[model samples]
Structure formats: C-alpha cells, structure tokens
Target: SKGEELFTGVVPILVELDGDVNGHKFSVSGEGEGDATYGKLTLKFICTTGKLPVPWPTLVTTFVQCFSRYPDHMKRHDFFKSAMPEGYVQERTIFFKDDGNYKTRAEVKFEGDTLVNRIELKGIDFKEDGNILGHKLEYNYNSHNVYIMADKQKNGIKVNFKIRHNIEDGSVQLADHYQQNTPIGDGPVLLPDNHYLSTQSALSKDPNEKRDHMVLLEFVTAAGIT
Candidate 1:
C-alpha cells in the first residue's frame, strides 16, 4: 500500500563553498562590497514530454541567449527586438544580478584577474532562485563567470504537485521514464540532472528534457482528501 503523505515543500537548490588562500579563509557572500556580481544565463530546454500535442518541446528548444552587458549591446542582442529583453520565453527569464537591497548572486575571491581561490553559493528556498550567491565582476575583465559553480550543490526543482511517497511495493514514475527513487526534501537530494540546460556539451550534456515531463500538477491521494 502506498503512503498518503501530502507536504508543502520548497525543493531546495544549494551551491555553497569556501576559500582557503595563503592561510587565510573566506566565504562567498553577496554582502559588503561585491554587489555587481550576478548571472544572466540562458535556461535552454526541449520541453518535458517527448510526445505532446504542442509543436514545442521537440520542435523547439528555448530560443534564449545571454543578453550582453551594457545598453547598446543589450539592444543588438535582444532577438525579439522587444523593449524589455526579458527572455526568449517570459517565464524562464534568467537574470541573476545585483540589487541595491536584494544583493547579487555572488562575490569574488580574485578581485581583478587571477583567481587563486574563491567560494560560491546559490540556493532557492522558494520556487524562485536565490538573491545572493558567490562572486562577480562587471565592466572589467579578470575572472568573469555569469553562472555559479556546480560543485557542492543541493539543487532543487521548481513546479509542484504529486510529490508522493510510496511506502509499499508500489512506486511512482515520472511520465518521461525518470524516477524519483527517493522522496525529495529541503536538502538530502542531488542529481547531475541538467540536460535541458546544457545539451551536447562535451563535459556536461542534457538531451533528456522535452514536454509534460516537467508539468506541474495539482492532486491528492485517494486516502487523503485534505
């Protein structure tokens, strides 16, 4: 018999690290001085389902590219030629940056050029990504990285419903043949599962994302109605 357990969860995503340089230790924070550091990534994907009615997923991957910094560059690169240059699709707009109060996604170990050491972190307690992370540099060239590091991660997935626990012999299966062998929680889960974001990459490839696969559902078990 399957267990009837309904939980309101914030599938977390974490990437935390520290630095040790010349016998001095430091942490990656978005406070104090490193405010301009952030990421403007292209979360490209093929939908969740391989077979869907819509022409998307298979017929289309996200037409997204990282918008260049500076005003003139932004205008030239904004493909849709729209005013806001939000993203290829509005929902997956990826602009991780500095804010006056909110803070940037990262701070740097290398102040200008050579990165002898550094720390990085990024997590999402909510469906949205975090406000601060590692380190960044702008309008200058040194150790420039838009996205945070992938090591020491406890990444979480957004989109919800049907997060179940099958206690007995019965097991839950994702439509796309993916299986959540263990129940997801605030932490305790990690996967090298970023195919949609990086397909055909020699070091990191992801060709398994397609439609309905990442669909968000709303339902309840027969045993529990509340």
Candidate 2:
C-alpha cells in the first residue's frame, strides 16, 4: 500500500538545543554601565521538504508536527515554498539568511573563529548540473535572539536534490540524494509554469485532519518576541 510505502522511512528529532552559557554577551553595547550579563541561549530549526515533491506521508507528517501545537498561529503565518535563484533552470535553492530584518547569521560558539559551537549539515546541492530533481536534506541553525528574514544574495545557501523516482508509478521512490548552494527567498512567486507560487500555496491551508506519518513542532522561542 502507498501508506505503508510512505511511512516506511521518516525520522524527526529535536534539532535545536537549549541551554545556558557563562559569558557577557553584548549586541553593539551602548554607554552607561556597558556590563550587562546575557544568559540562556535558545536555538531554532528550519526544515524544508526535498526538492522533488515529497511523498504524501512525509508531507503530512511534517505538517502535523509543525502545526499540531499551533494550529491557529500556523494558519495566520506566511507559508512560502523554497525558490531557485534567478536565471537558474535546474537549481534547487536551499538555505536562506536574512538580508535585512530577517537576516540569517550562523551561530558561533568559539570566539574569533576558533570553531566551537556551530550549525552544519551534510547534504547535496539544490542546483544540480543546472537542473532540479530528487530529494535532499540540509540542517542549519540560527542562535540569534530573533527569527531572521531570508535573503537570496547574502544568507542564501545551496543543497543538491538527487533524482530518485520509481520507474513504475512516476512517483518519487526514495529521496536520498543531497546537494549544496540553496538560495533564500519567500516564494510561491509568479513564474511561467504557474508553479512558483502554486506549489507553496498548496501547503498552506486550515489545519484539519491528522495523519499517521505527520509530526507537529512549535515555534515557542520566537513566539515570546513577535
């Protein structure tokens, strides 16, 4: 059955870590005391589906996990599908950093680039051989105190989605390939195929039923601020 096929291999874990640190953190410190203590660091994890259409099971599982905790809030927030860079035919845009208000800056645990705490993932490039196909996974972390907006130029990174389709049914069989150079932008943009935006909107709808493969996650850290 398709249900069994889809549910066979999907794993979700606690990507972000929460803890306290011993340091005097300052963001462009002003005058006056100039000695404020910063404690407790919160991290966030952003997960995107494989470039190729995700299996129905994977999609449902991910949607449930993300919205189960915040059904009301999830419906209101903007849901944008990943987009490729301009003038790229087969490229699959991956990671995005905030260019302005939503800039994505990777967290650094080591001072002065000594390499301590960091966000990293092993995967393929989104734009592979000038074509977009298959499935790939990438993991990144933002330790800043706020959610960063996405930017294509600065914070946009890449990942490859290797093509894996079942020769029999035309459905994506196994999404195991990965890549790099994933771009960053809030999309569901207007394009020739009418898919740029269409694909994203399909994922945005009122929370309704739950599925066996789905998982729900909360944006608890960001809620306190915005």
Candidate 3:
C-alpha cells in the first residue's frame, strides 16, 4: 500500500541578502535548479568597497556557481541585475609584448569593461605583417563563458579564475593572472596589483596615475556554459 508522504521534502533555502555598510552597499543572493540527478545551487555575492569611487573601481563579486536548466517564478526576484559599478570605467590595457628578440610592434584591441561584453582583453601581436598585439590581464572584464584566445594561433593559453586584482607593471606569467584565494599580494617580492588597496596608501608611483587604479573592477553575474 502506498501512502501520501508527510513533509516529503524541504524547500530549497534560497534567500536574498542585501544591505549597506558605512558609505558602502552590498548584496548576497541564492538560487538553485535541479533535475532527478542533482541540484545546481548558486550564490552570488556583490559589494562595493572604496573601489567604486574615482579613488578606484574594484567592483568586488563572488560567484558560487553551477549549471542549471529551466526557470521558475517566485521571490524569483532576480538579484543578478544590481550590485555593480556606480558607473562605467572602461579603458584600454596596453602592455609590452615581452617576447624574446621577437618583440617588434605593439599591436592589439581590447575594451574590457563591465558585464555582458565585459571582457577586458590583452594581446601580443603575432604581427599580421609586422604588427603588434596584447597580453594577459584583468577587469571585471566580467567572466562566465570566457575565452582568453588568439587568432588561429597560440601565443599563450589561459582560467576558471577567481580574479580579484590587477597584476600591473607588466602583468606577466600566464599562471599568475588569476589572483586566487590569496588575492592581490603586494608582498616585498610579489607586489601584484592591489585592486582594493586604499587610495591614501601611497605606492612608489604617481599620486593618481591610471596605472595605480589599473587594479581590476570585478563585477558580478551568474553564467556558465560547456
């Protein structure tokens, strides 16, 4: 005999978290979808540090991501739209194509800005007739189905990266781009880009050079593809 089950299952713990701090604001939200096999749960956290101002635009975000199918309606409040740069600070990332005796021209194209087409790119010219290209870099240039690619060739390959910094001053090394769990290490020997370093904390550079603020403006959204 089959009986109707009592409290058969529990609802997914999807809650929306949003608030402000000091002169700053932030948010954390959860959403999930599933089939008979497993559930893909995701948590997107976004916040503004001192980075959103002209001081620096290091829009911070964290995505606990997984793939899901279909959709639903409810508090179904889409939390992915908000929690971003107070404004757009798009830029051109120019870097030296540090190759051996092969470095000739400085050639490339990159408009790595915020989400959507938020892909901040850097390249090194393989020279389409003695030309130039770009290099490895960051921005929120936002991620999710990302491709640090090339034109029918391979200068470097790249990240399921947890990007949170700018590795300025010739951000070399294909492996060093992703500023993983240990984000922005400006150590004595390893001074990568400090995307969130306070504006008052002076470094050995111009008081407010574009280089100083080259630290990445990590934006937010939930996206994934095979």
Best by lDDT: 3
Worst 10 contiguous positions by lDDT, candidate 2: 28-37
Model 3 steric clash total: 13
Question: Residue 187 in model 3: shift from native, Å?
Answer: 31
Evaluate residue 38 in candidate 3 and report its C-alpha lDDT on the 0 to 100 scale.
21
lDDT of 1 by residue, 82-101 (tens): 21111111112222222111
For each candidate, the alpha-carbon lDDT, in order, equals 0.19, 0.21, 0.22
**For residues 72-180, what per-residue lDDT tens digits would candidate 3 score against the true structure?**
2210211111111111112222222332111111111111321111222223333332111122233323232221211112212122232223334434222112311
TM-score of model 3 relative to the true fold? Answer: 0.18
Residues 1-226 of candidate 2 have per-residue lDDT tens digits of: 1111111222122322121111211111001110001111122222232121222222211111111111223222211112312211112222211110101122312123121222222123333311112222211111122122333343332323222323223333333322222223433321111111001111221245232122222232213212
TM-score of each: 0.16, 0.17, 0.18
Specify the poorest-scoring 10-residue window by lDDT in model 3.
Answer: 1-10
Winner of 2 and 3 under TM-score: 3
RMSD of 2: 22.9
What TM-score would candidate 2 get against the native?
A: 0.17
Residue 150 lDDT (model 2): 30
